[PDB]
Amino acid sequence: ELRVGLEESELWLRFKELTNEMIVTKNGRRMFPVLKVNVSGLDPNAMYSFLLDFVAADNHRWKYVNGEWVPGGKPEPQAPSCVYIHPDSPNFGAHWMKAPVSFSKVKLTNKLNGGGQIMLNSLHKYEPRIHIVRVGGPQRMITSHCFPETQFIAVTAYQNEEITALKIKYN
Numbered sequence: 001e002l003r004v005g006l007e008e009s010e011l012w013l014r015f016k017e018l019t020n021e022m023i024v025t026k027n028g029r030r031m032f033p034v035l036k037v038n039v040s041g042l043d044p045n046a047m048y049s050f051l052l053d054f055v056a057a058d059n060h061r062w063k064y065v066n067g068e069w070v071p072g073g074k075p076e077p078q079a080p081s082c083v084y085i086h087p088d089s090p091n092f093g094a095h096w097m098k099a100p101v102s103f104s105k106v107k108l109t110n111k112l113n114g115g116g117q118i119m120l121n122s123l124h125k126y127e128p129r130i131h132i133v134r135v136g137g138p139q140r141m142i143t144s145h146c147f148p149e150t151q152f153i154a155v156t157a158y159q160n161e162e163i164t165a166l167k168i169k170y171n
């Protein structure tokens with residue numbers, strides 16, 4: 001059975017319990033913490049690409065009001081994010097299972113941009129998700145996994161200084 005797990009879930013949980021925030025810029029900002037996934041149960045000899053996208057966790061605009069995050073009252077449908085291809089893709093099961101798959105080069109933007117960058121809506125809450133795509137072989141297959149622990153709000157600057165401090169303490 002294909003097992004997918006979160007490396008350093010203990011650090012992600014420190015961020016989650018304060019409500020995590022991720023900076024988004026015109027040119028795109030890398031994530032801290034970095035999403036790292038432990039994968040076991042692949043065919044060492046089979047071929048896979050690792051994809052990353054962000055699901056809008058709810059249909060609301062959020063705002064930092066008197067030191068607390070609160071959702072707007074007027075939901076809109078959230079068009080899903082674009083997919084980031086892990087640069088080691090495509091690659092052998094063995095490649096993927098030898099060390100945690102780390103998405104350190106994905107950059108989060110707020111502007112439609114050349115590409116590589118993933119555009120998110122500022123002040124929307126997002127749940128990171130991966131697709132492990134079996135490629136090259138005859139029987140194409142996809143396995144998807146969400147990481148609730150890694151939820152954040154996309155912000156142009158940090159609102160909760162407790163987040164600012166955790167980010168600096170552990171980078």
Ligand SMILES: OCC1CCN(c2ncccn2)CC1
Binds near residue numbers: 085
């Ligand atoms: O058929 C598989 C899909 C096609 C695109 N993919 C890709 N592209 C470039 C490098 C690594 N992977 C993976 C998803």
